Subunit: 149 residues, 6 copies
């Protein structure tokens, strides 16, 4: 099945939202395939935020995402990339609706708690950038036949 | 007051979402008038899904809804049919928004956890098809005057 | 597996605790085998409270448990009778510890929200008294092998 | 930072939603600056609902908001006035989306549980009308740098 | 009915536990009669902690409880003083059991999140010390007859 | 500060309890220092369960803990080893009290959802056995001074 990359940013860890966030994906029916607590290197972050390499805020972005530990995750399921984004809510917490992670839990786009892959192709980039393939665990949910036909 | 029929499907029971679902209707202010745990017969299911009698997936639908027990419910209140549907979310979990039952809890339209009456008229059909009239309990909530003017 | 009878009393329904209570038994791993929303008849209640037939408060007890609808349940699992009682907490909410249903949710022994069978033998009495055998649904949880060895 | 006035109405207190509502604003990241449990006087209420002084329902509105205690609050943060309104949901619970306070918790516009300032200017009116300036507490959240850049 | 004084300490407010704590008392069935957000004066604190006036840590205690705003509450109900203490848990979070406020939410006795009156007589002292009598609101819960016989 | 090793077992992952468990440790005030999703090797498991090397069930234990992925964690705080065990509850879910992880979420000792180090010395063994020292992240909580004096 399809897979997406979700990172809980420094502010999401600091504010004690790690279990809250993981619970949303579990209760939805998505399968945890990768989980990892790290301090992302500025190099790794530079590669991650490469489409913004020439934007001005880039320097600060990489500085901040390096300022503390992140929880890197890989989740799997039908349309997990788009649905994951719906579950996170709008990138700017101000346009995020109640019920979503950014809608419920944060305020400002610079401290917006979480990242999710925006496309299947960027998902595959980011999973590959953040995880070794032997760090991705494959198993079958006991609930699979009740989640999918 | 108005009444709607809500059924928790086999996957909703299997995944342990019965208490979760009932809680959403209680905390909203709607009144439980009927509650019943059953295995719906293929006959009963055929009558329930009669507008899809000639559609192709019909056979599988009836087979699946018979594959395990369902929780049949009747809820009552102002606009409960439309609001109930809003609370369930879009029939395809993929269009369901976070905050709704299908939005929070499931992924695929074939395993979409729950059913709610789509109209007042289909509500009355379904309540009559699934419940004997002496199975419907009438009482007054202690909170009624704080729920309604 | 072992089975117990749990009834949510009129005050538990009035106070909107039905979904909350069911959720505690689901998340524990117990299997719902019977669920039923009714107004218990004074006759049925008299048989239920027969060990207190000659106690004085008996009249009031039967009057109260008839004063509104109850949710009658049958739950199944290893030691469900004793564990169900531990989950409910002490019969007097005043001795009930936080974390339990009566501990979390109620105050006075006369309005103590819930009933659970006190023994395997009284469980079998009460299941037989409150449920027709065809109202008890048998199925296998998708999670069974992860709940039991 | 910006500030808004939020009042939990008599029905919100009666239905035990005070901690629920406060939790939504805390977990969002907004800062509690004022909190106060009162019975609003008909005079105070008349000033509060002054734009509806000549509307017909006015009499009933003031009578109801006086019928029981309200929890008056002041919350602070980036765009708290508009975001607060988004968090409350539509004034008519019928147009309120799941995930929001009125969407999750109530049904009818006459018993709609909560009030929030509709503009920065009405916010400043209402804060001044409901709170003495020494009742507003200023402090710095330990989480501030993780909520704002 | 009996009344107790409960104060959420500076660390409880800082850590965003105000709504959480109030919710435990509401869902239990106790009645909020007083609610107030303040910075306790060192004088007021000295009177509050008068039995520890000659203990050494006293100076620090008063300094800390003055270091930030507290939520002062009065709650009412059958045995609310002792039950309130049971709900808070042991004063040292290390002896607090899961399910209780201190058991769930904190670690160290010096940052133990909350205060509750230890006796009916100290309750009456503290309510009188912290609240003006016109700040205490009297009303009847819609749920009273379902909480008490 | 003191550190303990906590592993969510295959049944805890299968049953969707990962976010629930992590939330209990976060909300308590403990600091996540290590997080890791893996399939434990039979060799690693043999070293982990070495005090039971000569017990008979050993073979099955290692087979089961290898049967699916586990979430390995390191948590840090005052008395985290003993408190962690209190939070998990009794090793046999049957003696576990409501409010605890095993008390709330599981039934049978063979499927008891979670592991926590039983001593400071076994904690140090297990952290060293399961984590590389560069996988343990050090940072300061924004809430530290509100958790500890």
């Amino acid at each position: 099945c399809e897979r997406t990359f979700i990172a809980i940013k420094p502010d999401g860890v600091q504010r004690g939202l790690v279990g809250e966030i993981i619970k949303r994906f579990e209760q939805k029916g998505f399968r945890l395939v990768g989980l990892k607590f790290m301090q992302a290197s500025e190099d790794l972050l530079k590669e991650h935020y490469v489409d913004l390499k020439d934007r001005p805020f880039f320097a600060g972005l990489v500085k901040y995402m390096h300022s503390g530990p992140v929880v890197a995750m890989v989740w799997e399921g039908l349309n997990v990339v788009k649905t994951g984004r719906v579950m996170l809510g709008e990138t700017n917490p101000a346009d995020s609706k109640p019920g979503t992670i950014r809608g419920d839990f944060c305020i400002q786009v610079g401290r917006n708690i979480i990242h999710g892959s925006d496309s299947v192709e960027s998902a595959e980039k980011e999973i590959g950038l953040w995880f070794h393939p032997e760090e991705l665990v494959d198993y079958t949910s006991c609930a699979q036949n009740w989640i999918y036909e």
